[PDB]
Design a protein around this ligand. Structure first.
Ligand SMILES: CCc1cc(-c2[nH]nc(C)c2-c2ccccc2F)c(O)cc1O
Length: 207
């Protein structure tokens, strides 16, 4: 288990997301599905010239998995996945420069729903989650588990859990008052509203 400190600007983005009074929290799902879509686009582009890039899984899809007993919402995709270097380097984002632009936008009038325009939409997960576990598998690396309850640190470990072939799994350990995002009709509503032009099947698992 390795423990790393976020870069100051990233810990400042995370505490802004957690602390600001802002009711439109549902946008986290749009932000996580949009990332899944971008990673699936990346593996699909690679497969156009190299069919073997799909040996670790031919099906390109997004699964939404609520679990009321564990109080988790899991978003699974069969995208390009991330390397350890990608996980440590802010989950494949240019987060330092993205946070800086997002902060200027907010001061000038923008709102938290615009986070994805600054390439840092992943961190919108902390609107509804107290802890986020990122499980990922890239063709060029091993399966890793990134985890953080914010508070300025995150951990990285080799995942000894269930292998995923390729892709990314975001486990959201929801806040106590945010369990509406485990209800079928609520997730369905959010998908129809914000993710209607995703070019991959979005399957909402039932319990
Ligand atoms: C943890 C954030 C997250 C990352 C990925 C991901 N997997 N593989 C890559 C390239 C990416 C990626 C996508 C957008 C921006 C940056 C990224 F690194 C994903 O599929 C879903 C996600 O919820």
């Amino acid at each position: 288990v390795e423990t790393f400190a976020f870069q100051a600007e990233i810990a400042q983005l995370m505490s802004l997301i957690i602390n600001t009074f802002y009711s439109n929290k549902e946008i986290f799902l749009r932000e996580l599905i949009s990332n899944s879509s971008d990673a699936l686009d990346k593996i699909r582009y690679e497969s156009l010239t190299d069919p073997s890039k799909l040996d670790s899984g031919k099906e390109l899809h997004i699964n939404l998995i609520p679990n009321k007993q564990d109080r988790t919402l899991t978003i699974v995709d069969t995208g390009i996945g991330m390397t350890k270097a990608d996980l440590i380097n802010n989950l494949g984002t240019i987060a330092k420069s993205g946070t800086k632009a997002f902060m200027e936008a907010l001061q000038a009038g923008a709102d938290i729903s615009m986070i994805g325009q600054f390439g840092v939409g992943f961190y919108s997960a902390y609107l509804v989650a107290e802890k986020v576990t990122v499980i990922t598998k890239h063709n060029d690396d091993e399966q890793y588990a990134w985890e953080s309850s914010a508070g300025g640190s995150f951990t990285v470990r080799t995942d000894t859990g269930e292998p995923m072939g390729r892709g990314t799994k975001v486990i959201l350990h929801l806040k106590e008052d945010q369990t509406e995002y485990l209800e079928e009709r609520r997730i369905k509503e959010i998908v129809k509203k914000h993710s209607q032009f995703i070019g991959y099947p979005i399957t909402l698992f039932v319990e």
